């Protein structure tokens, strides 16, 4: 996240941070970030698995907060299943079905337990988006400019506004590259942007004065570039798709 | 190729004092958190004493305060827990084991040792410790 806050607990419980393991004993690296939307289920961007798409490559880690103490029986889950979109494309400059589904559970086979610092978000009524202009947050702990190659060490927030088609798909933005299952959105002084190590994380828009997971971080030419806002998988045409995989 | 090893097991009077080392092979065990819990032949696992990857933060199961002490060596991949004025109530296995803690997390090892060690990663075989007349 490029500008913006450093967050605490109960501010994004519903935050996955998703690591890769490495070979050995040698610690996880940080890849991407996601969003439990049922007890077992997170949701999260393709693009942060294909190049290795099984499961058994990846843990992931929930409850983050500098309060909270970490508690490896409940805050930490294997992937039990790894569900990439099927028609995820890459294409030469944005991405198609930037999507991917988690089911995870701890060492003793549980789904996540809620508490103050782990929630599930819910997800929005079909084809429903806040307005644009509307203020959403989002969350991670990628980069915190694009040129630096550094990720932050706790987790940041910042506040977006949504970007129309309209506006997004004009020629000195990103053109016919932006289609509808994708939503816009950024800072109107450009200072403040989703950025590298974002992807799979939220996108929190308030659907009627509640808040809902509008998007994905999925892409974005540069980071809080003007005339480039970060874009996002639209949730909101997913949804069948995702309670397919679920139920 | 990860192997944690506890050593130092044995018969002590009660009253007598007792170490115990945890080594690892095959990893840097400088990056992990670690335990050390124990069985007893009646209970079920508990987290005796736990420590931070630095050093810097340690926990003590109420049953043991000021009578154990944990500590580290990550120049020579070890952890030891000293174990003074000890009492039969402290007869059982002992297992040394070690948990990466991702970043964004207090800065305590509270947790990882109060919860009977579900979920810590890497797990070494255990020695005996045993106190009696």
């Known amino acids: 996240i490029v500008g913006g806050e450093f967050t605490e607990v109960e501010n994004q419980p519903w935050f996955a941070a998703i690591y890769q393991k490495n070979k050995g004993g040698s610690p996880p690296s940080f890849k991407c970030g996601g969003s439990l939307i049922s007890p077992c289920w997170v949701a999260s961007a393709a693009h942060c698995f294909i190049q290795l798409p099984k499961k058994e490559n990846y843990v992931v880690y929930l409850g983050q907060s500098k309060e909270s103490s970490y508690n490896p029986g409940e805050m930490k889950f294997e992937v039990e299943q790894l569900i990439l979109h099927e028609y995820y494309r890459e294409d030469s400059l944005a991405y198609h079905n930037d999507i991917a589904l988690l089911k995870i559970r701890t060492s003793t086979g549980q789904c996540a337990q809620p508490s103050r610092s782990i929630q599930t978000i819910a997800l929005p009524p079909r084809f429903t988006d806040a307005p644009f202009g509307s203020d959403c947050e989002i969350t991670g702990f990628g980069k915190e400019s694009e040129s630096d190659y550094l990720y932050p060490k706790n987790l940041k927030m910042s506040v977006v506004k949504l970007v129309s088609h309209e506006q997004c798909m004009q020629p000195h933005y990103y053109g016919s590259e932006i289609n509808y299952k994708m939503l816009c959105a950024a800072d109107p002084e450009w200072k403040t942007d989703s950025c590298k190590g974002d992807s799979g994380g939220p996108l929190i828009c308030n659907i009627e004065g509640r808040p809902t997971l509008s998007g994905i971080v999925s892409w974005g030419r540069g980071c809080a570039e003007k005339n480039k806002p970060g874009v996002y998988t639209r949730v909101s045409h997913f949804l069948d798709w995702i309670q397919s995989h679920i139920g | 190729q990860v192997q944690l090893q506890e050593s130092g097991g044995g018969l002590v009077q009660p009253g007598g004092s007792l170490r115990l080392s945890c080594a690892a092979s095959?990893?840097?065990?400088?990056?992990?958190?670690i335990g050390w819990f124990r069985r007893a032949p009646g209970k079920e696992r508990e987290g005796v004493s736990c420590?931070?990857?630095?050093?810097?933060?340690?926990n003590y199961a109420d049953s043991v305060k000021g009578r154990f002490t944990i500590s580290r060596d990550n120049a020579k991949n070890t952890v030891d827990l000293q174990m003074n004025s000890l009492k039969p109530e402290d007869t059982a296995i002992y297992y040394c084991?070690?948990?990466?803690?991702?970043?964004?997390?207090?800065?305590?090892?509270?947790?990882?040792?109060?919860?009977?060690?579900?979920?810590?990663?890497?797990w070494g075989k255990g020695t005996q410790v045993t106190v009696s007349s």
């Open positions: 084991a070690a948990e990466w803690v991702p970043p964004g997390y207090g800065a305590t090892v509270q947790a990882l040792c109060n919860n009977a060690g579900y979920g810590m990663e890497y």
């Open positions: 095959g990893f840097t065990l400088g990056y992990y958190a």
């Open positions: 420590i931070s990857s630095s050093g810097g933060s340690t």
